[PDB]
Design a protein around this nucleic acid. Structure first.
Lengths: 243, 192, 113, 213
RNA sequence: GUUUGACCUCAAACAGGUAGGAGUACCCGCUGAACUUAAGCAUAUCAAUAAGCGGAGGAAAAGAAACCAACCGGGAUUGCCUUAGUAACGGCGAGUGAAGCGGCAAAAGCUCAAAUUUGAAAUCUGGUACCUUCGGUGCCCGAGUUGUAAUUUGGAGAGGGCA
RNA sequence: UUUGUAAAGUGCCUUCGAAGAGUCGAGUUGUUUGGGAAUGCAGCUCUAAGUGGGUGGAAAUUCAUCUAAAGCUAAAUAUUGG
RNA sequence: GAGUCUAACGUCUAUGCGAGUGUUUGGGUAAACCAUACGCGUAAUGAAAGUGAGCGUAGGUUGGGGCCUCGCAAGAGGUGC
RNA sequence: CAAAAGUGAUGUUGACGCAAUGUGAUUUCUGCCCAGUGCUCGAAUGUCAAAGUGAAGAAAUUCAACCAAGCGCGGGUAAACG
RNA sequence: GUUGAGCUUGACUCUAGUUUGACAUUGUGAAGAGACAUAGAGGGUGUAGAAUAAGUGGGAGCUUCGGCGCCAGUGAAAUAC
């Protein structure tokens, strides 16, 4: 058989796109450890969209030269960031929606967006629109903390993370569905991946091993295990429960 | 001999001194790179027997080698075919890893020519050989008969052909029984 | 260093360096130190610490203790050879022939050893 | 088992009347085995009817069994003999045939009469397990006294041990070494692993305590 | 604080000389295959070479014993004639296939240590300071004589000085 | 000129000397068709002695023979752009 | 322009010279002449316990005789190379 | 998922999502099965790699050969195949 | 055609991959739980039989505090040491 489409992922022409055009998608910069009245903390400036996220963001000023020229500080968009209200940070910070501050300082059952989870990453969890995680691993969880990430599963965290308290801005992808597919293709150019899809049974067993038969059906198997090769591993990857 | 503070240690590296000392001197090399200098030698006893009647120009550099065997690409696409070469770490070859260390310093510092080397132990990262390099300008060395030839132009890249002890083993030199066919060069008898 | 086994004090370490114009003859160099030993031509051995590489100086606390002179550690090399009065900065030295200092030289050797 | 104290465990034991408790009679020395790791199965089961070169020794109360000139030779030695009718006469009751397993140790049975023995006299001779030697009608019974010393039983049967005698106080310690080593030799080298299977043996006198080697 | 120095690691600018490239064949080394044959057949075999890259020179390139003979005897490398399809290997199938001995040509031999641990009068060196123009002056790294011997151990074989 | 310096020959007196370890090769592989398979030869990793060690296609054993692990060297010869 | 200037084996033509002959590199009187290293159809055969066959020379069957060992020279086994 | 390895996409997206597969807005609904095979889950209990017998004297030396998993067995499950 | 390529299955040969275990590079104290070597140390039934019966063979324990296969008897098997 030929080269399967899932193998063409690591490199490719379809795997190139605009990188430096992207002004700064939503990490978090240096923002003051202290809050001895605060040093590096200020107001929100502009509201600008970075490509990659598919949601509005913002610019912020602190104590440092940030309106135009210095290209870095992008601030996490909560409803409704704009000119004339302050952000605060620090360790033992003031707990408000729109303030970036620790997980340790917030009590159990606070919703948080743009949150770290490994030992430092600037900003990982829930950067775009709609998204948020839920910190519920303090109190009888004594030393090592735990964000219970939104499905059901795990993640052990030491001290770990800062993040903005709240639910993030937007809400118009699940809350409001689209209309057509060329307007959906605006996703797959700010992200690098093939689009759309053709059926596995419709493709030849040559090009993808889910084909086979004059009366078309699945040739090999739909459930394939985790430890497998490239063309071998397709379909539902380890169907733990069917149905 | 009297130098059983180098010799006793160099032959028996298993001793209490060098399994401690070469642990902290391989640690020293985990910081350092392709080439790096050494002061007066680590084993100056074998260094003098090779050729280290000193002067500046007579330097010594510790150099790394490679990992794997004789590496080639991995089988992408097919795996079978005619399986003449299947493995990624397949064959070895004639030359020792002395030569590998010697030409990495040899073509970087082109002016400084290769004499001969010895091993100074290793870690799990690479093997390390200390290459003694000479200088072709350096006199006293040119006034010595022992190092006259090495300075004059024919004895540039002694490793690349077969003049250095390691490059002798690329042709056919050890004195013994089947030295009759493999007397001169390997291509003179033509691989027999 | 890992060289120094038993040690002397710093104030008397200086007084060991200038053990050349107060005895008579002195040889210099760490070869001539290990050379010194059998027939007891070396009396005081002046072990410097600061000698590169350290493989040279690890002879001196061992070899010179087997066949056996009472050595003593000088403070450093930089004012060892200078206080002998040679050319260069001597890596070690030994006191060979004694002048008047035998009784004084006895408390250069036997303080450490 | 060692070849070290093979003389010594005979010598000191049989020497004193402190270890062994010497009675009225001449204490008859044996050597039993100690065959650990042996399975009473097919393979490891030894049996036979061999003999040791200086003779194992036992005699005591001897019975003869024969007709005709066997009876004449028997009582010319001084040992009494059963005939065919007298063989039945022990068997027809309880006590006398079980008492034939007791104190009557050595046995002779003549040619035609040997094959009569294991039909009547047999189930009573289970433990203890005495049986006559191969004696014909032409053999001399006085010269067969040393043959009933010599030919001893070898049976593993139920257990692991094979008890055979080595001598007595009639022998010296020297002779008894070349009886002890002979016993072990028969069992050991036929079944591999050998001397790690053969455990801790002591030479029993009669009344002779532990002196294992 | 503060006063005075040696080796490891290990720089940048002015200013005599010195050099680039165009080319063929011959050789050594390295990443290093294959069309093919046993009518085919994955491991015999095209083969350590092509092709590509590196290295040395005017010849390249080799070599003076950790050798053969076989108790009779001899003594480097290299080329040629005898040799050898012998002695072995491979579905013992294609195929591949030495050594020793005699003769001919042209045949001379040497650099390193009681290892090394190495330091000064002087010899004497790589780098480098002052003088500031290759001439004069100075220090450290250092090579053996030498100032002067050991270390770890041993023998009756044999060497060295002086003229 | 005996060259105020370097070597040899000749002649005399007096007296006693050595060794190069990542190599020898090794658990295992291999540059070698590993087959009982020398040698050439050292990937991953470690690793040996100078009256002692090594070559000679199995080993115990015996006889003849050589002394590495640093280094150099003329010709018989190969070949062309002009 | 379509069976051929390589080159091995085997009958045979011609043939200096033959029971010993004929070489080669090369020398050199130079296509001559001299030298004679050395060849010339070439070893049976026993799963594991030797001999070396006259260019190479064996097989089948049998008599005589030399040598060694064990044991009671009762007799057994090779020597038949 | 690419690459010999360094180094990256996936991705300054993050489950309110990323992707492989099944699929198709609308509107009323959805009965039944553990033999056979895959994926997943579980521990009562069965198997698989490190002995030692033999040669120095007219018949009396020495050293190289059994323990784990998947499996068996037991438990979960049919938008994985049936 | 003892044809070529694309291209296939739990046939079979084999490999990148995948998965589990072991060793070197690579140091240092307590508490709890095993194995070997064993100084030492023990867990049992069919009836009759004085009485609480697995062996094995030599063949003989009736007392300086104290028996029941000597003798004599019971039993499927019958002392001691």
């Amino acid at each position: 058989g030929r080269v399967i489409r899932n193998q063409r992922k690591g490199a490719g022409s379809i795997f190139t796109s605009h990188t430096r055009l992207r002004q700064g998608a939503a990490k978090l910069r240096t923002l003051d450890y202290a809050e001895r009245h605060g040093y590096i903390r200020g107001i929100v400036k502009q509201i600008v969209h970075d490509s990659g996220r598919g949601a509005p963001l913002a610019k912020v000023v602190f104590r440092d030269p940030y309106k135009y020229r210095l290209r870095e500080e992008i601030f996490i968009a909560n409803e409704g960031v704009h000119t004339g209200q302050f952000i605060y940070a620090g360790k033992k910070a003031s707990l408000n929606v729109g303030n970036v501050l620790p997980l340790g300082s917030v009590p159990e059952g606070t919703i948080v967006s743009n949150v770290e989870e490994k030992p430092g990453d600037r900003g990982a969890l829930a950067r775009a629109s709609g998204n948020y995680v839920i910190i519920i691993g303090h109190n009888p969880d004594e030393n090592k903390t735990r964000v219970r990430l939104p499905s059901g599963a795990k993640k052990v965290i030491s001290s770990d993370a800062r993040g903005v308290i709240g639910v993030i801005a937007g809400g118009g992808r699940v809350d409001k569905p689209l209309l057509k597919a060329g307007r959906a293709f605006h996703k797959y150019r700010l992200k690098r991946n093939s689009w759309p899809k053709t059926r596995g049974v419709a493709m030849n067993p040559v090009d993808h091993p889910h084909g086979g038969g004059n009366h078309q059906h699945i040739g090999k198997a739909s459930t394939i295990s985790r430890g497998a090769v490239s063309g071998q591993k397709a379909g539902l990857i380890a169907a733990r429960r069917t149905g | 001999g009297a130098y059983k503070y180098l010799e006793e240690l160099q032959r028996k590296k298993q001793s209490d001194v060098l399994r401690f000392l070469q642990r902290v001197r391989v640690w020293e090399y985990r910081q350092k790179n392709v080439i790096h200098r050494a002061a007066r030698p680590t084993r100056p006893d074998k260094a003098r027997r090779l050729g280290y009647k000193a002067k500046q120009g007579f330097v010594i550099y510790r150099v790394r080698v490679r990992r794997g065997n004789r590496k080639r690409p991995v089988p992408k696409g097919a795996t079978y075919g005619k399986p003449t070469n299947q493995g990624v770490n397949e064959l070895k070859y004639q030359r020792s890893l002395r030569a590998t260390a010697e030409e990495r310093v040899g073509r970087r510092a082109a002016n400084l020519r290769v004499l001969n080397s010895y091993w100074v132990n290793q870690d799990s990262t690479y093997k390390y050989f200390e290459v003694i390099l000479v200088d072709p300008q350096h006199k006293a060395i040119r006034r010595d008969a022992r190092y006259n030839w090495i300075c004059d132009p024919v004895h540039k890249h002694r490793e690349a052909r077969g003049l250095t002890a390691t490059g002798k083993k690329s042709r056919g030199i050890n004195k013994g029984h089947k030295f009759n066919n493999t007397k001169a060069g390997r291509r003179k008898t033509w691989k027999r | 260093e890992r060289l120094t086994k038993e040690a002397a004090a710093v104030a008397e370490g200086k007084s060991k360096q200038d053990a050349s114009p107060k005895p008579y003859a002195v040889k210099y160099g760490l070869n001539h130190v290990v050379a010194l030993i059998e027939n007891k031509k070396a009396k005081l051995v002046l072990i410097a610490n600061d000698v590169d590489p350290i493989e040279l100086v690890v002879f001196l606390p061992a070899l010179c203790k087997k066949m056996g002179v009472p050595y003593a550690i000088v403070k450093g090399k930089a004012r060892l050879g200078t206080l002998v009065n040679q050319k260069t900065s001597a890596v070690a030295a030994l006191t060979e022939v004694r002048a008047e200092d035998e009784a004084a030289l006895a408390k250069l050797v036997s303080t450490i050893d | 088992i060692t070849s070290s104290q093979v003389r010594e465990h005979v010598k000191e034991l049989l020497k004193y009347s402190n270890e062994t408790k010497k009675r009225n009679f001449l204490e008859t020395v044996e050597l039993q085995v100690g065959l650990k790791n042996y399975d009473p199965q097919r393979d490891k089961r030894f049996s036979g009817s061999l003999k040791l070169p200086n003779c194992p020794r036992p005699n005591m109360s001897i019975c003869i069994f024969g007709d005709a000139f066997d009876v004449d030779r028997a009582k010319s030695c001084g040992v009494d003999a059963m005939s065919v009718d007298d063989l039945k006469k022990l068997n027809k009751n309880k006590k006398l045939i079980k008492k034939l397993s007791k104190k009557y140790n050595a046995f002779i049975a003549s040619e035609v009469l040997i094959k009569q023995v294991p039909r009547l006299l047999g189930p009573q001779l289970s433990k203890a397990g005495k049986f006559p030697t191969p004696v014909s009608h032409n053999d001399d019974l006085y010269g067969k006294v040393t043959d009933v010393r010599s030919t001893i039983k070898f049976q593993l049967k139920k257990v692991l041990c094979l008890a055979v005698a080595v001598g007595n106080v009639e022998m010296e310690e020297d002779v008894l070494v070349n009886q002890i080593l002979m016993s072990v030799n028969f069992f050991v080298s036929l079944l591999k692993k050998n001397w790690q299977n053969v455990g801790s043996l002591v030479v029993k006198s009669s009344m002779g305590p532990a002196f294992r080697l």
